[PDB]
Amino acid sequence: TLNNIVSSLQRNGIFINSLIAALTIGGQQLFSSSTFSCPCQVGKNFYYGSAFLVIPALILLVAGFALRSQMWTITGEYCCPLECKLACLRFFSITGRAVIAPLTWLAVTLLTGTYYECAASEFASVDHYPMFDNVSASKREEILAGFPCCRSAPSDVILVRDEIALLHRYQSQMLGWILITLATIAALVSCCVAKCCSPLTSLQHCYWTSHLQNERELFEQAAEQHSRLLMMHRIKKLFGFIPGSEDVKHIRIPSCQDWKDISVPTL
Amino acid sequence: TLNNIVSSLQRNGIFINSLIAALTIGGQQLFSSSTFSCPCQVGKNFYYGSAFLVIPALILLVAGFALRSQMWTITGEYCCPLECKLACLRFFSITGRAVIAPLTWLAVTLLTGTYYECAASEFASVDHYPMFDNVSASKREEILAGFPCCRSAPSDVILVRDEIALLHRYQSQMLGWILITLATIAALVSCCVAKCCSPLTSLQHCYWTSHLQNERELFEQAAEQHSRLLMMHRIKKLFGFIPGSEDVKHIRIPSCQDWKDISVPTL
Amino acid sequence: TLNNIVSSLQRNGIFINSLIAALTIGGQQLFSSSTFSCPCQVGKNFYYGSAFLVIPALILLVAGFALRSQMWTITGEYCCPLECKLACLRFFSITGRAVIAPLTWLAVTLLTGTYYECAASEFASVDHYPMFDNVSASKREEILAGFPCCRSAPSDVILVRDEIALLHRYQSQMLGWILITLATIAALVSCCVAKCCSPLTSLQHCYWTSHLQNERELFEQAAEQHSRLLMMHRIKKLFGFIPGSEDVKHIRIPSCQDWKDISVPTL
Amino acid sequence: TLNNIVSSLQRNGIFINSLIAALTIGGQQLFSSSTFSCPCQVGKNFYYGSAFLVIPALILLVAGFALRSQMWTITGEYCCPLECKLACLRFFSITGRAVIAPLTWLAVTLLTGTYYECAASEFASVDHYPMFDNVSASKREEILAGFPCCRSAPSDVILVRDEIALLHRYQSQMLGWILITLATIAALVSCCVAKCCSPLTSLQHCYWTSHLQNERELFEQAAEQHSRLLMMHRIKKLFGFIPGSEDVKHIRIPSCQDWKDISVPTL
Amino acid sequence: TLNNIVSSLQRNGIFINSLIAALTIGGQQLFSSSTFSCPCQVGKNFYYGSAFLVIPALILLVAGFALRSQMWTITGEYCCPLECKLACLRFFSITGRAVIAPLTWLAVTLLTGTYYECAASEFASVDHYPMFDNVSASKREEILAGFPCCRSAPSDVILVRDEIALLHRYQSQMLGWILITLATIAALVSCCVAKCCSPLTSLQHCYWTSHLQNERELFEQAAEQHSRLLMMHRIKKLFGFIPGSEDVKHIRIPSCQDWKDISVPTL
Amino acid sequence: TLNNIVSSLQRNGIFINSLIAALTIGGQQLFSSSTFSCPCQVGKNFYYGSAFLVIPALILLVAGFALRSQMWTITGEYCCPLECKLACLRFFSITGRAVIAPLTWLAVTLLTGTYYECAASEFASVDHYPMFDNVSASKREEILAGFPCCRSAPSDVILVRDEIALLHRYQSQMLGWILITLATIAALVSCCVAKCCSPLTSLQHCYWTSHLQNERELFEQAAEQHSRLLMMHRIKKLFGFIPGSEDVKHIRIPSCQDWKDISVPTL
Amino acid sequence: TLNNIVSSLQRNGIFINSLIAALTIGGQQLFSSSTFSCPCQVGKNFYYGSAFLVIPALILLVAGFALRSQMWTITGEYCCPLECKLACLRFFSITGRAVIAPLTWLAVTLLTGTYYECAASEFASVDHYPMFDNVSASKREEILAGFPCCRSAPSDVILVRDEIALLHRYQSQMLGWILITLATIAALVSCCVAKCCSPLTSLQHCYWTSHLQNERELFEQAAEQHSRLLMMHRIKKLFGFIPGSEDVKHIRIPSCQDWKDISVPTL
């Protein structure tokens, strides 16, 4: 009864997507809490933010795309009528499985907001503040870039720093919610257009998916058994018996040529 | 049902790669936290950093290459047409399995950044600082090399030290992300060119891999059983019975010559 | 299914080597943390270091060599053509299994570096220091040998002591990495030359190894059963029945001579 | 499958030797930490040290010798050609099993070194010290014997005490390592000469050992069953039935003489 | 498989002796730590020590002697040629089993030494001490007997008290080691003379021991079954059926005389 | 296999005696630590001590005597030749089982000694003390009886109190050891005289004990089954069927007289 | 094997009595520690003590008497020769089972003594005290009744209070021990006279007890089965089938009269 429920869960795409999202959330939390520290330099801040903000998303998207076995077969069908549309729907299902990880990464890393603070701590619009009128541009950038990591100045500085930080947190969380909403709407309309352009009815689709799955599994098992039988026959030609038999009555000692015979596997 | 899932996991290259990466991450964490200490000498710092940065990567790469049994057979096929391409694809799969460990080692040890600080704490560009103009070159190197390990000087020194350390941490993490991105792109394009140059179709590849695996396993088992039968027959010639039989009726006491007979195994 | 995986692991030389290395690492850690203390005398320091550095390596190497049963049989074949090369390859495999322990001992005890500090705390090159010019040679050695174990002097002394200790730690860890690299290169080229000088092909080697293993096991079991049958027959001659039978109908009481008969085992 | 692995471990002499060594190490640790205290008298110190250093070794050696059943049979063969050499090899195996305990006791109790400090705290060579010139011989011995257990004097006394203690610890640990090395070399050359003087080949030895083991076991079981049958027959002569039968139809009440009959066991 | 190993351990005299020794050690530790307190009177100290030192040893020796069932049968054989020697060897084995407990009690209670301090705290040789010259004999005994339990006097008194206590601890532990060595030597030479005077060979001894054990067990079981059958027959004569039968067809109501019949068991 | 070892332990009188002794020790410890407090009155102390010292011993002895079922049957045989001696031996075995509890109670409560202090704190021989010469007899008793429970007076009083308490503890523990030794000697000589006066040989005794045990058990079971059959037959006469049968075909409704029939059980 | 030991324990009256005594001890401890508080009024103290001292004993005695099923049947035999004596012995056994609870309640609540202090804190004999001569009778009672619960007066008052409390504790514990001894003696002599007046022999008693037990059990089971069969037959007359049958072929729908038929159970 164990493998029954195991396969029932494996079929559930919802469970797999939930597992992927939860693992990405935990990994993002650990990654941020462990190996993140603002450089607070003059020009090397925005890049340090955008790297952690963007690069893991691209990496996880590429990983979700390439790690899917069926994607390789589909590309091989494409790489050097109805088949085109069915391949399009297969590619669509693969993309739907893959997109979950980078999307949840972006969403969580924006809702936490600590990356955006260190990302755009230099573009802060400072125009109506009492302490930022006399200072030159260079020292202005210098004292503005020192806000995110630490604080050491009198109370007015920490007040304006908290204000700027709260503004940037608001901007980050708003961007995160906008991304969530836009992504959900896009996914919904994409599933809708996929249902619209599907040449199969509601029932033929189920049969088609089951057909693809069963095809891959059965061909794997059958090719395995066939090659096993062939190698067993070559072994019987070499030694003179079957590896599975018991109390073998004839044992043919190999000669110096039959080793050369078995050296090549005939591909 | 246990061995079913055990073999199912063993087949999953993703699981094995995840295990290798996690073990390397844990080992790197323990290794760094336990047996690392900056020498903070005048010329013996960059080497102390580059050693921990580089040598374990080379060692783990060589270990991932040599520990693969199939690699030895392939090299023996090479060491003193279609076969060439199939051997190339096998070598490619072995390299794909092996490269994971040193890559993750480099990635984690750069993202942590504590090795790079002690690695290039001497090349620090000190040109626009108030305390480093009057001091001579030798004492400048002396006070610059004492930054990474400890702090003992007044507040200006600790301020410039924190600034230099943050700059170097930024550089280290940027190098780590660049390495990650470049490596992922290289792996993707390499899998692409491997799919392009493959003389087999999408289905022949599965049969070929299953064929190699089954060939190795079946030949091992068959050679074992054959040698066991041969040694059992020599034992029956020595003592006069089969090691597996029960209630043996004839027991031939060995003579002083038959010991010499069994002394050599006939290779 | 238990003994299946047990034997599968036992076959894996990688698992056994990993276990040996981990056990040696743990033992070295406990040994160093428990029963090590620097004597800090004038001439009795370098020996106290080199002992812990060297002697356990030699002991573990001898233990890895002598504890291998096959090594005794090979030496007996040597002690008072093709056979020579096959024995050479067997000796090579035994050496490959054995060398792991002293190598990992040296590697870990050098990477930790605490043994090297107490080993060469007397050869410290003291030529450009402000406090070591007026002092005579004897008191110089006296105050130099008191550095590794403890500290009791003013701040200049502890500063120069920390500098010397860091220099020696750097030297120790560099020597450790050099040893690791040289040993790995030597092992690789030795496996290469072993593959080069092997008179067997890639397939004959597998059969040969399985043959040796099965030969030893089957001969053990067969000799055991034969001697058991012989002793059972002598027991039947003494008492008048078989130790395995039930409801024995005849019981021959032994006489005063048959005890003398069974006193000798006929070798 | 339990008793399979139990017997497999029992055969492994390495496991038994490891267990003996570990138990002796633990016992020595507990014994030293619990019931040891330096008397710090004038002439009663060296004996108090040498007792704990020596006597347990002799006791454990005698225990390892006498507790071996086969040793008693061999001595009986000796006590009031080829047989001599085979008995010599058996005695050698027994000695090899037995020697492990006192050797590890000496090794651990010397490496810990706390016994040697209290053992030779009187032979300390005091000739170049500032406080030991004016004092007479008797008070010199008195203040020298009070060093190991406690300290109560000014700083110069505790300094010279720590120096003497470190010197004696160095001497103790050096003696321990010398003992370890000499013992390992002796054991190796003794196994070598045992292999040299063995009249049996490499294969006859295995058969001989299995023969001895099976002989002892089978004779025990057979003698047990024979005596059981004889006593069962005497019981049937007394009461009139077999202790194993059920629904016995005849019950012979014993008479006043048959009790005298069963009083003696006929030896 | 449980009772197999249970009986295998029960046969091992080494295991039983180890259990007895460990239990006696634990009991001695608890007994000493719980219910021991020095009276520190003038004449009632040596007895309070010697009681705990001696009486438990005698009690445990008598318990080890009398609790052995075979000892009672042997004494009955003695109480109102070859048989004499065999009974002597049986008595020897019983003594060897029994002596372990009082010996280990004495050994542990002497090695701990706290009993000997309170035992001979009055015989202290006080002849060369500065405070014990003017005091009379009575007050001398009074202040000497107050040392073991407590301390309340100035520093010179506590110094001489610690010296006397250390001297007595040394004496106690030396006596303990002497007892251990003498006892082991006596046991060894006694086993030797037992092997010398044994009229049986090495093999007849095993048969004899197995014979004694099997004799006792089989006679117990057979006598039990015989008496059970006899009582079952008397019950059938009383009630009219067998206690083991089912669906009994005849039930004989007992009369007023048959109760008198069953009142006596005919011995 | 459970009930096998359960009955094997139940047969072991040593195990039952150990359990009784341990339970009595624990109960005495709890009883003393919980509900004991010295009254410290003028004449009501010795009784308060002797009660706890004596009464539980008598109670436990009576409980060990009366709770034995066989003792009741033996007394009934006595209450209104060879039989006399056999009954004497049975009574002896019962007494040997019973005496353990009060003896261990006395032993432990004397070795702890806290009961004896409160028992004879009035008979203290006070004749050579500096503070007890001027005081009258009444106040002397008053201040002497206040020693065991509490202390409130100056240091001389607490000193003499500790001295008296230590003297009484010594007396108590000496009495306890004397009781232990005398009791063990008495038990040994009593077992000896029981072996001397036994009319049975060593083997007839085993048969006799097994006979008594089996007699009681078998008669119980047989009487139970007989009465069960009789009541089942009366039930069949009442209702018309057997309580064990199924699908009974005839059901006889009872009449107003048969209830009167079943009202009496015919004894 | 579970129910075997369960019934074996249930038969053991000793186990049931131990359980009852332990439960009563625990309940008394909890009851006293939870809901007891001295009123310390002028006339309402002795009643508050005697209530907790007496009433629970009477309640537990009545509960032990009435809760026994056999007691009801015996009383019904009595309520509106040999039978009289057998009923007397049955009543005796019931009383022996029942009396344990109130006796142990009284014993424990007297040995703890806290109830007796609050019970007779007014009858304190105050005649030779320095502070109780001038005070009138009313205030004397007032200050005497305030002793048990609390203390608030100077040291002389607390001294005389502790003295009175210790006197009353002594009296309480003495009364408890007297009760224990008298009760045990009464129980012993009562069992003796019960054995004396028993018209049955030692063996007829066992049969009689087993007869009573089996009679009750078998009659219960048989009456149950008979009534079940009768109701099943009435159900078959109502509906037309048996409640236990399967695939019933005829189903008789009930009419408006047969409901009236089944309305009465015919008693």
PDB file of C-alpha atoms in Angstrom, chain F residues 14 38 81 103 115-116 154 168 207 219:
ATOM      1  CA  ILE F  14      18.051 -17.553  45.839  1.00  0.00           C
ATOM      2  CA  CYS F  38      12.567  11.318  68.213  1.00  0.00           C
ATOM      3  CA  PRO F  81       8.054 -42.567  62.749  1.00  0.00           C
ATOM      4  CA  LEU F 103      16.754 -10.864  59.906  1.00  0.00           C
ATOM      5  CA  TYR F 115      17.213   3.724  65.510  1.00  0.00           C
ATOM      6  CA  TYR F 116      19.707   2.680  68.186  1.00  0.00           C
ATOM      7  CA  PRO F 154      27.178  26.191  73.019  1.00  0.00           C
ATOM      8  CA  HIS F 168      26.322   4.889  70.164  1.00  0.00           C
ATOM      9  CA  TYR F 207      12.230 -36.979  44.181  1.00  0.00           C
ATOM     10  CA  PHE F 219      -4.812 -32.459  42.888  1.00  0.00           C
TER      11      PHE F 219
END
